[PDB]
Design an enzyme around this catalytic site. Structure first.
Site, PDB file in Angstrom:
ATOM      1  N   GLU A  17       1.079  -1.085   0.078  1.00 40.35           N
ATOM      2  CA  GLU A  17      -0.095  -0.067  -0.061  1.00 40.35           C
ATOM      3  C   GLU A  17       1.016   1.128   0.062  1.00 40.35           C
ATOM      4  O   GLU A  17       1.833   1.182   0.635  1.00 40.35           O
ATOM      5  CB  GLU A  17      -0.916   0.161   1.199  1.00 40.35           C
ATOM      6  CG  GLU A  17      -1.996   1.045   1.049  1.00 40.35           C
ATOM      7  CD  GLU A  17      -2.574   1.242   2.297  1.00 40.35           C
ATOM      8  OE1 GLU A  17      -3.875   1.619   2.414  1.00 40.35           O
ATOM      9  OE2 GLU A  17      -2.009   1.340   3.574  1.00 40.35           O
ATOM     10  N   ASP A  75      -2.030  16.494  12.213  1.00 36.52           N
ATOM     11  CA  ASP A  75      -1.398  16.083  13.601  1.00 36.52           C
ATOM     12  C   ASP A  75      -1.325  14.540  13.354  1.00 36.52           C
ATOM     13  O   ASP A  75      -2.210  13.763  13.287  1.00 36.52           O
ATOM     14  CB  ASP A  75      -2.399  16.021  14.582  1.00 36.52           C
ATOM     15  CG  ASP A  75      -2.355  17.240  15.360  1.00 36.52           C
ATOM     16  OD1 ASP A  75      -3.156  18.123  15.586  1.00 36.52           O
ATOM     17  OD2 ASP A  75      -1.039  17.602  16.001  1.00 36.52           O
ATOM     18  N   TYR A  77     -10.956  -1.882   3.312  1.00 37.63           N
ATOM     19  CA  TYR A  77     -10.287  -1.488   4.497  1.00 37.63           C
ATOM     20  C   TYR A  77     -11.072  -1.254   5.820  1.00 37.63           C
ATOM     21  O   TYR A  77     -11.859  -0.483   5.843  1.00 37.63           O
ATOM     22  CB  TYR A  77      -9.638  -0.158   3.927  1.00 37.63           C
ATOM     23  CG  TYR A  77      -8.425   0.369   4.744  1.00 37.63           C
ATOM     24  CD1 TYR A  77      -8.117   0.406   6.003  1.00 37.63           C
ATOM     25  CD2 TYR A  77      -7.178   0.509   4.084  1.00 37.63           C
ATOM     26  CE1 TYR A  77      -7.359   1.102   6.640  1.00 37.63           C
ATOM     27  CE2 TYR A  77      -6.061   1.184   4.936  1.00 37.63           C
ATOM     28  CZ  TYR A  77      -6.250   1.317   6.295  1.00 37.63           C
ATOM     29  OH  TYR A  77      -5.041   1.604   6.732  1.00 37.63           O
TER      30      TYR A  77
END
Lengths: 261, 258
Positions: free
Chosen positions: B50, B61, B176
């Protein structure tokens, strides 16, 4: 004649204050309360607003603003809704500068030019595209120019000369000084930005205490912007809309007071 | 006619293993080393890759993935280069599935059709658009269909039903999941709607999480940031960096034995 930020800064300097700019996600926790939130920030002494539109990013879940995005999405906030809400704030507060902090996704989704047209219709002053560098910013700036919108860029401590050139040539309104933190780097960058003739700096990262605002102004910034800390107040009092507002007013008053003397 | 992922899962199913899929940012820490890293991961038993393309998001962040972006960009990695590196990995590894995890920005920037066409040319199997929800994925799914790329979607546990039949219908390759090992339940509906095989991708950084994912009923696990952390902590010694990635990848793949 002067744009809203140029006027703000000159007026504030004559009053010996810097600017305090709070950030909230539009539609958090819902449209009607988000409208009350925005007005409360203005009424309590915010010198301008910085506003974000919500979108889903599950891989980046956890930080406060992403939390806001989830709430606003659960409330079915859409960009059409965000523009309607901005229009109402503008109608009630004709003098208050309104900036958007956008990610590119929503700006591309219905066309770049379309987005900036909607900005002008809603009375937005500035758009900061958080995730596109200056050297790829051309179609954003062309759109901004056509619709009379000030482009806002981020200037990190490491900014190159060609980055700061772009900021000064393309940017209007203010520069978003992202400082992740001894003081010399901040002093250096402020002085650099002036030499390049960039728009006035607002320090924008990790600003949560009034003392940080006062320090930003003392170092020579024009003001400070607070992301997370305003949104956090909303999250802490989700159960009680009325206390959200009184706590947002109290925090805003404290932060604006630190812009003085 | 089987895509690379279908041929993979057929093999894995015969071998009584689930899938291990590491994530890296293309060009991290520079293009030449990234090409060594990608080959090292495959050689060390990664079932698929991936891969991310770097871009600047300084407000973000997320120190691990942020540092990867910064490193790759300081080394002058661009989308053009990302596609060139992908093509080299593809030539040397004709069967290995290659999935892109992308933010929309880079996909819109030079046109959606253009991007997926370059994926086709490069030998990319799948694209996951990280920041566009299934019910807004129409132009991505259309370009994906047009150029023979499999769209991959994230199924968050919070998600309901119509979001979820949309993921099973529109999605190809794998699904996913951000569930941790509620999960028995969410996997159940996915298999009930004929979704592509489910990989767990939340916080997978130790082999015991890989074994737990499979035991939990998932087809495999994706390690979303762990591999980038090994890169980050061995920046001063490229040969060691590769030895640590081999060892980690070996131990993660072993944990896929059912």
């Amino acid at each position: 004649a002067m744009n809203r930020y140029q006027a703000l800064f000159q007026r504030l300097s004559a009053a010996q204050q810097g600017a305090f700019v709070p950030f909230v996600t539009i539609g958090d926790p819902n449209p009607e309360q988000s409208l009350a939130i925005m007005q409360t920030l203005i009424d309590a002494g915010a010198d301008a607003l910085e506003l974000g539109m919500p979108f889903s990013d599950p891989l980046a879940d956890g930080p406060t603003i992403q939390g806001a995005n989830l709430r606003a999405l659960a409330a079915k906030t859409t960009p059409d809704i965000c523009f309607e809400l901005i229009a109402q704030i503008r109608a009630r507060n004709p003098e208050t500068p309104i900036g958007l902090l956008m990610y590119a996704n929503l700006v591309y989704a219905r066309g770049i030019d379309d987005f900036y047209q909607r900005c002008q219709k809603a009375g937005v002053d500035s758009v900061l595209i958080a995730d596109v560098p200056t050297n790829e910013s051309q179609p954003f700036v062309a759109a901004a120019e056509k619709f009379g919108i000030q482009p806002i860029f981020i200037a990190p401590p490491t900014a190159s000369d060609e980055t700061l050139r772009a900021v000064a040539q393309l940017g209007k309104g203010y520069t978003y000084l992202l400082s992740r933190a001894a003081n010399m780097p901040v002093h250096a960058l402020l002085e650099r930005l002036q030499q390049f003739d960039a728009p006035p700096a607002l320090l924008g990262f990790g600003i949560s205490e009034p003392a940080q605002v006062k320090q930003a102004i003392e170092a020579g910034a024009a003001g400070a912007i607070s992301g997370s800390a305003v949104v956090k107040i909303i999250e802490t009092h989700l159960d009680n809309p009325a206390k959200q507002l009184t706590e947002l007013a109290n925090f805003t008053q404290a932060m604006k007071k630190a812009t003085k003397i």
